[model samples]
Target: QRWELALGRFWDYLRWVQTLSEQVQEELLSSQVTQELRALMDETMKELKAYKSELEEQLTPVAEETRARLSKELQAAQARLGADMEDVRGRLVQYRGEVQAMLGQSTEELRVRLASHLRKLRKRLLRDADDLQKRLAVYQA
Candidate 1:
């Protein structure tokens, strides 16, 4: 459980860093302080990456030990979780492809539906990005 928590925290931190990076990129693109901001963003990313690497290194042995000590049932549970993760990944990819394909359909009916769905998607994406940023900051700190 402790190892799982650590890995979860690490992933949360990475997500936040990714969101922050994206926001910085957009802001830097239009700002007068672009050079300075970009430099700072680069430094921040470097620090975050280094911190992530260190955490992974520290957690590796614990994770391995946990895996090694797992009961047969626990191993089966882990395998199930892995399969679920892959299934979810496949679904996400399929969804992305569907959304992209929608771009090629220019019918008024499809356009209306796409616009509504896209709005919702954008909102969710922004919320996720913000949540990730917050989580990353918490993990790193």
Candidate 2:
């Protein structure tokens, strides 16, 4: 989100600088000052573009890795636990929805919902893990 804001601000600044340069030229400002301002604006814009590209490049790999790891873990865990994992998965989905709601609208109501959902998710995951462990022990018997 910060990157998105920065990109928008960069475009705004570029437009402002172009307008200022045109106005200064029309007013017959010193050529040296005009040249210096133009150079500075160009440099700033280039730097902003570079930063935005760098951020995008970094985010792509991190997002891909996270998705892959989460998918693999979920598949393995579900295979081990069978249908018992559904309760935990449902709680996780509920928790994710609450978190997204909190992000989208940081109201008191959403915050309360987030907290409640998180608590329920935590309890469900713990209970599911305990049950799975007991079932695994039965395998050893």
Candidate 3:
């Protein structure tokens, strides 16, 4: 079965491999080819650690730059949205005023039209009353 700590114990395993080429265990596994293989592992491990450090060093700045840019973009977007909302509110208030003005003008016009009609009707009514009084005077004579 595969060990769950395979990756976690990789450094330990590498250290153990170094012990294989010691003076005491010269015959069990140490040969010319195995010595070359262990030497290659040593060089490869150094390169891997160097590459890992390089990755971490570069990752920090790139992540920080991306986060900083996103923060600025978010703030700019929020400001733009706030301005848009104010513009809409301003338009709404102007439209409300315009509607109220129109309503007032229409009401005033209707009032003038009704007043004109009532004036003419009252004039005709007074004329009819005058005619009735003149006929009653002639009949009394």
Candidate 4:
């Protein structure tokens, strides 16, 4: 369950960042989640909304101009980003299938061991039954 939760959140993070403008994405990549001013403030002053607002105030001006200038630069970048996203999806699906197969193989191995032990127990029971018949004959004589 925890694995699923982490994977789900990871996908959300990727999608969230990918949807942002290139300049905003670059700005976020360069900036730390926590700044010196944010670090000095108490939790009440350093809430998530405040943190987001601070980043927006700084990034807003660049977002305005960068988008216009990057129109030509973005076509190639978009193609590369799309290719990477497809590759990541393929790898994740392949990994999940391999793990499922491994679990199935391990379960089958456990079942095979249990059946072998049961067969050994039945062989022991037959040996005991034959010995008891000879002992009963001696008693009758």
Give the clash count for each candidate.
3, 0, 0, 0
Question: Per-residue CA lDDT of candidate 4, range 29-108, in tens?
Answer: 23231132123222222232243334344443445455444433333433343333344334334433544566645434
> Model 2: per-residue lDDT, tens digit, 53-89?
4534433334666656644553454344333334333
Point to the candidate with the largest lDDT.
2
lDDT for model 3 comes to 0.37
**All candidates: TM-score:** 0.31, 0.29, 0.28, 0.25
**Per-residue C-alpha lDDT of model 3 across residues 14-123, encoded as one tens digit per residue:** 23432333341332222433344344434433443344334344433446666566445434533443333233223323433544567545444433443454345334
In order, candidate lDDTs are 0.40, 0.41, 0.37, 0.36
> Would you give me the overall lDDT of model 4?
0.36
Regions of candidate 3 where Cα sits further than 4 Å from its true position: 1-62, 106-141
Task: Candidate 4: give the clashing pairs.
Answer: none
| Model 4 misplacement above 4 A | 1-11, 14-73, 105-141
Cα misplacement distance, residue 16 of candidate 4 (Å): 12
TM-score for predicted model 1 compared with the true structure = 0.31
